[PDB]
Design a binder for this molecule. Structure first.
Ligand SMILES: *[C@@H]1O[C@H](CO)[C@@H](O[C@@H]2O[C@H](CO)[C@@H](O[C@@H]3O[C@H](CO)[C@@H](O)[C@H](O)[C@@H]3O)[C@H](O)[C@H]2NC(C)=O)[C@H](O)[C@H]1NC(C)=O
Ligand SMILES: *[C@@H]1O[C@H](CO)[C@@H](O[C@@H]2O[C@H](CO)[C@@H](O[C@@H]3O[C@H](CO)[C@@H](O)[C@H](O)[C@@H]3O)[C@H](O)[C@H]2NC(C)=O)[C@H](O)[C@H]1NC(C)=O
Ligand SMILES: *[C@@H]1O[C@H](CO)[C@@H](O)[C@H](O)[C@H]1NC(C)=O
Length: 167
């Protein structure tokens, strides 16, 4: 029962960005499955360079633990704004991180986050928001808006569900 982790953390990235996938920490060869297809990659870390839409999908890893890991889903976008989340499924009590990310890392200003239409009441800083103690109420669909260069943009919406800690 290994686990795929990403670095950076975001599973929603921009076309052309990089993301590294690592199979669990007890592993000191690895088997990777992209959309259920055995990869040619055998190291404990899978590197996705200059992300393609094709790289989107389900990724599972396999170590000498005779049991594949839970899947992880990657999605590549091309837009001016992209709402990134630490997780699309957060356990109650854990933190939830959101980031209104701009294409090419352009600076984003006047960042506003929305949850089910309503603009977030929580207090937050520019383009990086931290929700420390996730609650069932933090479930909802989110998206953000911000000013890039001289115009105002809006990211695609994302759905975030908060489940209970137990099993
Ligand atoms: C793995 O499976 C996923 C299905 O969840 C595949 O993702 C889909 O891939 C396409 C690109 O092939 C994504 O982009 C679309 O492509 C067209 C043509 O290039 C583009 O013009 C559209 O604007 C659109 O972006 C599509 O969004 C994507 N779906 C998701 C949910 O990410 C993926 O390609 C599969 N990879 C392999 C190697 O099988
Ligand atoms: C992200 O979450 C939202 C809401 O949680 C999803 O949109 C909602 O989708 C449901 C169906 O899954 C819509 O309800 C349906 O309405 C039709 C017509 O009245 C009815 O016949 C069906 O029985 C069902 O009740 C609902 O209106 C819609 N809400 C909104 C605000 O659009 C959305 O699909 C999710 N996105 C993804 C990618 O999962
Ligand atoms: C991704 O990594 C490669 C080197 O492995 C680098 O040349 C490229 O600039 C990186 N892409 C981004 C968007 O940083």
């Amino acid at each position: 029962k290994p686990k795929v982790s990403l670095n950076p953390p975001w599973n929603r990235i921009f076309k052309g960005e990089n993301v590294t996938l690592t199979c669990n920490g007890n592993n000191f060869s690895t088997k990777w499955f992209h959309n259920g297809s055995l990869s040619e990659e055998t190291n404990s870390s899978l590197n996705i360079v200059n992300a393609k839409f094709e790289d989107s999908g389900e990724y599972k890893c396999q170590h000498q633990q005779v049991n594949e890991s839970e899947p992880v889903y990657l999605e590549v976008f091309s837009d001016w704004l992209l709402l990134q989340a630490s997780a699309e499924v957060v356990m109650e009590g854990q933190p939830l991180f959101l980031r209104c990310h701009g294409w090419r890392n352009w600076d984003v200003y006047k960042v506003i986050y929305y949850k089910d239409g309503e603009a977030l009441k929580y207090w937050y800083e520019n383009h990086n928001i931290s929700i420390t103690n996730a609650t069932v109420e933090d479930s909802g669909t989110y998206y953000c808006t911000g000013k890039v260069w001289q115009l105002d943009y809006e990211s695609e919406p994302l759905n975030i569900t908060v489940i209970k800690a137990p099993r």
